[PDB]
């Protein structure tokens, strides 16, 4: 997706609880650096629910696509308060931003 459009979405809907940079601080939610390829609930220093901790999934384009569409459906019991992003293209652009931002 479009990394540029993705940044705006993140800035507006995720930044209140998440940081994406290396060394990024944990807020209400965990820092997301190193997200791609990482299993659920593995950001060091953050205390996840057992639901997030044991989902047993690796974050990547396909998983994030499903998660971001409806978080609680994908991870029942999650303490992440977010209803989801319905438009497929918006999830794609956001996901493209995450791919970049969390690995640089």
């Amino acid at each position: 997706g479009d990394v540029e459009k993705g940044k705006k979405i993140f800035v507006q809907k995720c930044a209140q609880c998440h940081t994406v940079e290396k060394g990024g601080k944990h807020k209400t939610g965990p820092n997301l650096h190193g997200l791609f390829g990482r299993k659920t609930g593995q950001a060091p220093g953050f205390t996840y629910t057992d639901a997030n901790k044991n989902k047993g999934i690796t974050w990547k384009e396909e998983t994030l696509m499903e998660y971001l569409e409806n978080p609680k459906k994908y991870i029942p019991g999650t303490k992440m308060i977010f209803a989801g992003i319905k438009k497929k293209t918006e999830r794609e652009d956001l996901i493209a931003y995450l791919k970049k931002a969390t690995n640089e």
Epitope: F36, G37, R38, T58, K60, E62, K99, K100, N103, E104
Partner: antibody, heavy 117, light 108 residues
Amino acid sequence: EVQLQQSGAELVKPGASVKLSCTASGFNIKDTYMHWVKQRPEKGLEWIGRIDPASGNTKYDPKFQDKATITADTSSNTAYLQLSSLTSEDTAVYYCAGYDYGNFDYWGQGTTLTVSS
Amino acid sequence: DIQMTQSPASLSASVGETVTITCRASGNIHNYLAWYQQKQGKSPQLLVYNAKTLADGVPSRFSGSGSGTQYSLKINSLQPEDFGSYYCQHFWSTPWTFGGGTKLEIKR
């Protein structure tokens, strides 16, 4: 103990098709992406594409879109590569591999395909 | 589609020497660059992923660095078992292309 066992060597006639398999064990193919890579004798690696068995979603290098078809039977822990309208240009070793963005990265032993009349 | 330009195609070196292989992507790949090693007649093996993280079982004489479109694989004090071929591959976007490869051979 992760293992990726590929099918045996194949000898097929030009114009025919062939299907190679890659059976995993020690892991589920749904946990990562299953790739197919071609390598002609003494030449470099060519990424044909991959499949995300969990979502059935496939990706290909355009150069192979009309030649190869990657599938996966998540109900047998096996991935497959189907090559159509074979020519001498398809004679090569084909590797399957399971991996995505991290340290989990395992390759099969490869399958040698010879296309000849 | 992003293409990887790997150089040199051939590299002559001696045991004990330090050597460097480079990969240039046709577009920014944001550190999603892996390096694979392929010993003569064997299957490729992951050596480095995410541009700088050594893979499991990989000796510390290996190291990778880079960012954007430029990346490098450095081998310090080459060992006899290091001679073979090396390939980079980006994971940024489909297709995940491999560089042309580098064949590390013995100088004489």
